[model samples]
Target chain A: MKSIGVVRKVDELGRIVMPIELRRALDIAIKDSIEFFVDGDKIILKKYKPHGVC
Target chain B: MKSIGVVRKVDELGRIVMPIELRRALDIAIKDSIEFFVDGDKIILKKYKPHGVC
Candidate 1:
């Protein structure tokens, strides 16, 4: 019923810019891979670690 | 980076609908609450449980 997140647009090239602070919050740096999952309509992103199961 | 997920549009009223099957995947159904979190530029959604810490 209430919204609690910011909006981002997907560029024509499919690349999106992330906020500097937010990147640090997750300890995700440049060149890190994000594993994508769809949980309902919301996109769930996890830091990629090869040993982890999807 | 590469695109690896489906795209969703936010409705004029700000309510976005999720696919029926995806709801069942996370055991989330109608009236279920999703907690919003930000990871980088991505909006991370988690099923809301009142007792859980933010």
Candidate 2:
């Protein structure tokens, strides 16, 4: 519900870069795992944790 | 980290059916949109909402 002031375009490989500020806010570092979710044409990204463990 | 005791096989179309129990638990109904995410060798599924709004 808030803006991160970042917008990215999907590359030819269908990849988009995450901003460092957003990464840090989500505690995502290099090599860290990320997850995706979809709902009714909406895409979501989240930090991945095995078995829901932090 | 709880098991729903459900196992599914992907069809030739690469489609897998979600268990009714799981769908009910996640409040996912028929015709609802789903999303896929990958991390390492792990895949995650979640219900999506546009603009982070439910």
Best by TM-score: 2
Candidate 2 docking quality: incorrect, acceptable, medium or high: incorrect
Tell me the TM-score of each prediction against the true structure: 0.43, 0.43
Give one digit per residue, the lDDT tens place, for model 1 in A1-54.
213444333232223343443345433555544455664445465444432445
Residue pairs in candidate 1 whose N, alpha carbon or C atoms collide under 3 angstroms: none
Tell me which residue pairs clash in candidate 2. Answer: A38-B35
For candidate 1, the docking band is incorrect
Cα lDDT tens digits, model 1, B5-49, are: 443333322233434433444435455545556644454654455
Per model, how much of the real contact set is kept?
Answer: 0.14, 0.01
Worst 10 residues of 1 chain A by lDDT: A7-16
